[PDB]
Amino acid sequence: MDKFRVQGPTRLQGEVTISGAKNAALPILFAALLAEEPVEIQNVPKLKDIDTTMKLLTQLGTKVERXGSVWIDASNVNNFSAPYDLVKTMRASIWALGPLVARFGQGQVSLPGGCAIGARPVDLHIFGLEKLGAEIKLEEGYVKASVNGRLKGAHIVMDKVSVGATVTIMSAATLAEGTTIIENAAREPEIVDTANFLVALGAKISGQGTDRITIEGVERLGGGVYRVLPDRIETGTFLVAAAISGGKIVCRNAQPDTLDAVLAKLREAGADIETGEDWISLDMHGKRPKAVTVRTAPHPAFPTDMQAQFTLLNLVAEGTGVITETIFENRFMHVPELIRMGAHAEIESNTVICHGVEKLSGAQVMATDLRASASLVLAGCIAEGTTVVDRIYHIDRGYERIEDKLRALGANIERVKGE
């Protein structure tokens, strides 16, 4: 298993060009299963989840090719059962189900994998497809969906906010007979991006970005070209990298309006932030951040995908800060690893009480998920000495070229094979 060896401390400063969103590219690639004509999806990041997705689509009979763009021809899709080996390596695999049943009348997918930060059920996806008329049965380790003829539009009220289920329902609804109204829909920027990609193929969707999405089903979707929006979590990660290291960083190919809460929280921490149409700069002026209070919640509130990174920020900040995680139940394992690097924190139910220290110390650390792993690498950049972060393949799932980007910002980093 590869590891990153980091020698700190190093100020992280300069510029970085943000890649397309991991979490918009994924639902768009699965939505392309609905397309009868060639599709070109632009600005797709080179991530392990994207590679897994391309392999999964190919196994269903999709013809896929990629470079910066990914080309999809789903005209000959003819196998409606997704293989367990690909399905279980990430979360996005659940999105194959709705498109398959909506377009072909049937689809089978195993329970997904992905960030091991909670039980992460898919009951809401099941709920929504059933509301659209699909029969759902759990057999042989598969979630099997089927319908005789078209799905039927429905007024669907979500009992809980779910990014994934909102995408599943909105996507399947595009080929349903009639109108679907999703109430209490997730508002994430990736949902807006997926909706607009669907519309480019001929779908009729309005309300994306709000809590109510209305879809008017059509007979079929064609093809088209669509550019994936910038990755707000990769952006937030590098803004935090500047903030915790006293540097100034300018993020290019950014979309400022997807980060209102994160930018506001960084300003509370003392950051001097400026934004333009497609860029964001952050200058800490060499100053230590001020501790802040953070509570994760559905977009547009502070994102759980920036939680581990802000935990690191508070742990090197001046004063006592708070991190409250309301979305996932097992997303604090980066904490004991940072404590081994010298941090001071107490976990109390779904909250971490942070007591910032001036400097962290290098150590052999490991996280079992994407954002926590990236956070340990940032901690290594600012700690004194050598930090070795094990199992960094987790980072490959969500960051394109994090090694080259961090090195361009000043990091002393090396990828090693290790034992």
Ligand SMILES: CC(=O)N[C@H]1[C@@H](OP(=O)(O)OP(=O)(O)OC[C@H]2O[C@@H](n3ccc(=O)[nH]c3=O)[C@H](O)[C@@H]2O)O[C@H](CO)[C@@H](O)[C@@H]1O
């Ligand atoms: C591939 C992708 O886009 N991943 C993102 C997506 O995941 P994901 O789509 O899984 O996020 P969800 O919004 O669906 O989950 C939010 C909450 O709802 C629960 N839930 C979800 C679905 C369901 O059927 N039942 C249920 O109980 C969850 O386990 C969690 O406690 O949004 C998360 C929250 O912003 C991000 O942190 C993930 O990086």
Ligand SMILES: *[C@H](C)[C@H](O)P(=O)(O)O
């Ligand atoms: C970590 C939560 C990743 O984004 P997912 O793909 O598993 O959701």
